[PDB]
Design a protein around this ligand. Structure first.
Ligand code: ZN
Lengths: 275, 377, 141, 142, 121
RNA sequence: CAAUACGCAAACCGCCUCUGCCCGC
């Protein structure tokens, strides 16, 4: 009921890998250009899975602010084959358990499912962020042309203990240092709660800079480092006049934890006057 | 903690499965040099062919095949390591170190596989009276592990590329439901999927040098040339356990390691403290075991007595860590005949079987230093 | 079960090579045998994802038979060595399953280089999809 | 909309036009991989569209072309069909020519149709201040 | 059986220029060619690199091909120099040649050799 | 006097579950 639209907060920037990355033994590449790239589903489905786990521990602190967290106890439906019950992860996809609130008004009240979207039986609430693919940057487009290898290979081994039987394989990783260019657009639909979802999306990004991005990750295959460039707002009046009436937020040398921390409320101050 | 820096106490070789042929090398001095064939070959054309494709494939009498660039040319090298030993008559294959841009780093898959050996050793010490209740749930083979009686006393007779550690990794880390065998490993059931180690910062060119590893245990010693990080280099690595990934899996982990964590307190809280107490009990025990054998070189014991009174966590890495340091079989010394029939089952000596020196015969030490010691803290 | 996989395969293999040309019989025989082809491939696993490169190779020039080209040389080259690359990349327990599927198509591919292009490859491509379709019906995909 | 003269020939030369992306779903607890495959257009392909606007009233076409360029300028920030929220859209209009096609065109056949200048302009640049200048000579014909 | 392989050595010496056959001979060569995988992947995957890409790399593609047989000595030059003797007589031609065309029939020959290598073993 | 004996990955997981022609003559 009552889908609305005030604007689209655009989060441009550049994903940096200080340590070498892997997606998936080749890293998948853009076919028309040959370059590897970080997809959309590996960056939206990774932030959701570092935010459904974060919400799982904290169902006492968010329940006073978010309704429809009282409808779940922090748990898992993996042993007990029940669809919607007290345990927090409710949808068996085919064999996996992903927290999706099964209604519009549950997902309207849910802190996860108002942002990363939610399916349902005759409800089907749709998302508010759209996360685009990340190709190489235009200064790193040219190292492919200059032959400076945008990728590499890696030979590991797997040691059987008794006979010391070496069982090697060849991982193929993106080389450490290669820099992509990501894109997240937040679809501002409800002016009552967008202070949350901008400080709530950066929550999922900040855990990702401590965690890994795709690949194995527990061995070195992560280390995202979000280099932001500029938030803009794109109001509804931007799409009628076509002006540069999009409020620029200055974050040329700031971190994901340096926006969500002190410094937030002065940056987004003109957007609040624009609501 | 984050960014727990390390230091290097002995030569340390992380292999990449690659050797430097003598057409890549020309040592003008006691220093050596790694020539750039792609640039040098394409730079020696201006003066002119098919002779380079004929001579490099021929491999004649190496010395002249690298000193023939000295005629009307010079100075084409890449890295220029140091020899640091009384060798190199080229006749060598320098095994090279893993490098990301020609810069040596330590891979995080190699420092995790050393912690995994230390953690596996601690699980088989403390866990036969409790090892049956782990496989009492959906395995039905603990009665064979109970009637034999500490699941190690069964596994010496259970065996009696190589998948020898398949059951023992499936007992200490991951009990599966069922298989054609009794049990198998499940990667989804593992506390070690919460252990995150990352690749270290790159070490530096100044700390990399060639070495001359002599093999001792036979009357005729053999040399192997290799490059390794010199002792005294210190880099920084960050290791942390994601405790949130253990709270979600409190009901899904099924292994003897999980039944070592529920006895020190909250099992998603003491796993990082269990982790280092497993390190300083596998690697100090293999440190003391090598003071028994005196077949090396004298000065080797003066390295081992100096490894004590050293703060931090001491562990092996790399290539010179022998069969004693990349294997449970330190714990399989006290069996004797229960492991003596099984060590010949797999076989060891070749070119029948080594009788009295079956496992521990080889020692690979560089310049009189037992190689592969890295101390975290 | 697997006892049907031993008898029905050895009943069919001498009938397989003795009709090596793909233009054997356009009547009810090539559909009646094709159910028996998937009948001893039922008890084996026979995963399709490795075959998806081969079938899309059969798909992308199936339009090109249809007024695209009159030459299936460049396509049928690519079908022969990749199907040898199927055991040539994937070995193991899926290799013993995929050796029995190798021995039916490899007699028929060598026809198709010198064959007609509008004919005798449609008679292969119809035998292609008869193997896949019943295989979904006996319980494999 | 069908592929441009160029991308017909990349189907003739041998370049692919559809890619098979494998996506997976994962349980938060047991890390249970739940995979699937998608056929999507290869990224960078290019289709030729054409949108005809039947001018019925000269009172309200300025405020009705602006609404079409508002729905297009949102579509460049949103996605065009498909899974979309995970990257699969991201479409971008490249304008070849605006043409007016007047009433005197259809009877006679004279090439007197008014052509606007939209060579290297974004969809937001038409609706930018200059919509009074891009379609200024359309006002002379009314 | 080495003479039947030497009978195939004339077939490797038959294809001096590039366009050997568009028919079954490139397979029938490669069946008898393939009648160690880990030593060749700096040409095998190096062929995969240069396909999408050039001329200065093909010298390195010829320099690495002689760098393989110049490394391994002893009993490890026999099938090495043999597999050396097939590829370069189809690569001495392809320096001054079309790149996207005229290489495919070797690029499909290079892949077909390793394909029957794993089937025969 | 210097090396060669051998290993290039095994597994499971392969789509899912919501909707399926109305309106006006
Ligand atoms: Zn929810």
């Amino acid at each position: 009921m009552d889908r609305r639209f005030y604007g689209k907060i655009v989060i441009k920037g550049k994903i940096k890998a200080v340590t070498g990355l892997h997606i998936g033994n080749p890293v998948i590449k853009d076919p028309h250009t040959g370059l590897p790239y970080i997809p959309g589903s590996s960056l939206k489905g990774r932030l959701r899975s570092l935010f459904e786990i974060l919400v799982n521990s904290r169902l006492g602190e968010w329940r006073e602010k978010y309704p429809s967290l009282a409808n779940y106890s922090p748990g898992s439906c993996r042993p007990d084959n029940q669809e919607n019950c007290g345990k927090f992860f409710n949808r068996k996809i085919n064999r996996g358990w992903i927290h999706v609130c099964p209604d519009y008004e549950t997902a309207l009240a849910c802190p996860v499912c108002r942002l990363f979207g939610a399916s349902g039986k005759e409800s089907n609430f749709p998302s508010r962020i759209i996360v685009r693919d990340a190709f190489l940057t235009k200064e790193w487009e040219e190292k492919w042309r200059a032959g400076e290898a945008i990728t590499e290979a890696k030979i590991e081994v797997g040691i059987d203990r008794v006979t010391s039987q070496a069982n090697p394989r060849t991982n193929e990783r993106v080389v450490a240092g290669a820099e992509f260019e990501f894109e997240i657009i937040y679809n501002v639909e409800n002016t009552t709660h967008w202070r949350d979802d901008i400080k709530n999306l950066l929550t999922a990004m900040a855990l990702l800079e401590d965690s890994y991005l795709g690949g194995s990750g527990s061995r070195g295959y992560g280390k995202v480092k979000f280099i932001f460039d500029s938030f803009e707002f794109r109001p509804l009046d931007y799409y009628r006049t076509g002006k540069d009436e999009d409020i620029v937020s200055i974050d040329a040398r700031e971190k994901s934890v340096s926006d969500i921390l002190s410094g937030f409320d002065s940056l987004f101050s003109e957007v609040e006057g624009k609501l | 903690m984050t960014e727990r820096t390390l230091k290097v106490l002995s030569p340390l070789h992380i292999g990449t499965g690659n050797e430097l042929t003598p057409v890549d090398i020309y040592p003008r001095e006691n220093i050596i040099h790694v020539l750039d064939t792609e640039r040098l070959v394409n730079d020696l054309m201006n003066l002119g062919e098919l002779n380079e494709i004929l001579a490099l494939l021929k491999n004649p009498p190496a010395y002249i095949w690298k000193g023939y660039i000295e005629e009307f040319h010079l100075d084409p090298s890449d890295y220029s390591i140091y020899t640091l030993k009384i060798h190199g008559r080229k006749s060598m294959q320098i095994k090279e170190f893993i490098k990301l841009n020609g810069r040596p780093y330590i891979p995080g898959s190699s420092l995790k596989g050393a912690i995994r050996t230390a953690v596996l050793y601690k699980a088989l010490k403390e866990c036969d009276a409790r090892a049956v209740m782990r496989v009492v749930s959906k395995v039905n083979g603990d009665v064979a592990r109970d009637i034999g009686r500490d699941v190690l006393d069964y596994y010496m007779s259970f065996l009696s590329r190589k998948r020898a550690d398949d059951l023992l990794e499936a007992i200490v880390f991951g009990m599966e439901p069922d298989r054609r065998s009794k049990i198998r490993y499940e990667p989804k059931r593992d506390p070690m999927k919460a252990l995150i180690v990352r690749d270290s910062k790159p070490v530096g060119r100044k700390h990399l040098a060639v070495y001359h590893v002599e093999v001792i245990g036979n009357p005729q010693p053999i040399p192997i040339w290799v490059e390794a990080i010199e002792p005294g280099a210190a880099t920084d690595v960050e290791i942390h356990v994601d405790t949130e990934a253990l709270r979600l899996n409190a009901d899904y982990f099924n292994g003897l390691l999980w039944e070592c964590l529920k006895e020190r307190g909250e099992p998603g809280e003491v796993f990082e403290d269990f982790l280092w107490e497993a390190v300083d009990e596998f690697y100090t025990a293999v440190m003391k075991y090598e003071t028994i054998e005196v077949q090396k070189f004298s000065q080797v014991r003066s390295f081992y007595a100096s490894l004590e009174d050293h703060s931090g966590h001491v562990l092996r890495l790399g290539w010179g860590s022998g069969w004693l340091a990349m294997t449970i079989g330190l714990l399989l010394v006290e069996k004797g005949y229960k492991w003596e029939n099984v060590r010949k089952k797999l076989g060891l000596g070749k070119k029948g079987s080594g009788f009295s020196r079956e496992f521990p015969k080889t020692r690979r030490l560089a310049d009189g230093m037992p190689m592969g010691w890295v101390v975290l803290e | 079960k697997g006892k049907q996989w031993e008898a029905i395969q050895p009943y069919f293999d001498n009938v397989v090579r003795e009709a090596k040309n793909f233009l054997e019989w356009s009547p009810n025989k090539r559909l009646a045998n094709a159910v028996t082809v998937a009948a001893y491939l039922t008890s084996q696993g026979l995963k399709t994802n490795q075959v998806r490169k081969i079938l899309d190779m059969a798909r992308t020039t199936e339009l090109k038979v249809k007024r695209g080209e009159g030459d299936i040389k460049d396509d049928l080259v690519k079908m022969r060595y990749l199907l040898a690359y199927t055991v040539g990349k994937a070995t193991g327990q899926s290799k013993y399953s995929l050796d029995a599927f190798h021995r039916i198509l490899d007699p028929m591919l060598e026809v198709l280089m010198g064959s007609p292009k509008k004919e005798n490859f449609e008679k292969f491509y119809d035998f292609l999809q008869a193997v896949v379709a019943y295989h979904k019906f006996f319980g494999g995909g």
